[PDB]
Amino acid sequence: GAMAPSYRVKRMDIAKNDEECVVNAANPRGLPGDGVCKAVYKKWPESFKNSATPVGTAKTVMCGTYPVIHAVGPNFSNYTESEGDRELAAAYREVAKEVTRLGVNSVAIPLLSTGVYSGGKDRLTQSLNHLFTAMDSTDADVVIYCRDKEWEKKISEAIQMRT
Ligand SMILES: CNC(=O)c1cccc2cc[nH]c12
Ligand SMILES: [Cl-]
Ligand SMILES: [Cl-]
Ligand SMILES: [Cl-]
């Protein structure tokens, strides 16, 4: 475990992370996809061997010895707000199981269902709070990765409001 488990946020490409494993915002079919998923495909393409997994689950595939945790959030274009909320919470609970099983001391993680799968709604708070519910009982250092400058400030605020 980490000596003093922490949350941090960085505004940069998750393919450049400084952590012991990465969470992909995957699609259910193991396709290269777009956004985060395509960045992860360019950096760790070997990790897409038999990475297909259902919505609300996570599947780990090693790229060398580097673990890529493929976490499949719901596409809110297709799910009701109610069912999508349940599947988004479930994906993050499966990420916490995988991070624990792997024995890593740090993990890089994007906010699931906040981009192309957001159904055109701002889900920063919803996705981050499900991230915290899952990861708070883990002892890995968690480093959240984002792109937007306003999102960086809001995620940083949310982390510090708990400390
Ligand atoms: C944390 N987010 C990202 O890393 C990300 C998001 C969207 C597109 C690209 C391309 C490279 N990285 C991306
Ligand atoms: Cl960057
Ligand atoms: Cl997304
Ligand atoms: Cl962002």
Swiss-Prot record:
Listed under subunit, the entry gives:
Interacts with mRNA-capping enzyme nsP1. Interacts (via C-terminus) with host G3BP1; this interaction inhibits the formation of host stress granules on viral mRNAs and the nsp3-G3BP1 complexes bind viral RNAs and probably orchestrate the assembly of viral replication complexes. Interacts (via C-terminus) with host G3BP2; this interaction inhibits the formation of host stress granules on viral mRNAs and the nsp3-G3BP2 complexes bind viral RNAs and probably orchestrate the assembly of viral replication complexes. Interacts (via C-terminus) with host NAP1L1.
Effect upon mutating residue 36 to A: Partial loss of mono-ADP-ribosylhydrolase activity
Segments forming domain Macro:
4-163
Q: Please indicate which superkingdom the organism of origin belongs to.
A: Viruses
Q: What is this protein called?
A: Non-structural protein 3
Its biological purpose is as follows: Seems to be essential for minus-strand RNAs and subgenomic 26S mRNAs synthesis. Displays mono-ADP-ribosylhydrolase activity. ADP-ribosylation is a post-translational modification that controls various processes of the host cell and the virus probably needs to revert it for optimal viral replication. Binds proteins of G3BP family and sequesters them into the viral RNA replication complexes thereby inhibiting the formation of host stress granules on viral mRNAs.
- Mutating residue 27 to A: what's the consequence? Partial loss of mono-ADP-ribosylhydrolase activity; complete loss of ADP-ribose 1'' phosphate phosphatase activity
**How is this chain modified after translation?**
Phosphorylated by host on serines and threonines.
What is the recorded membrane topology of this protein? Peripheral membrane protein
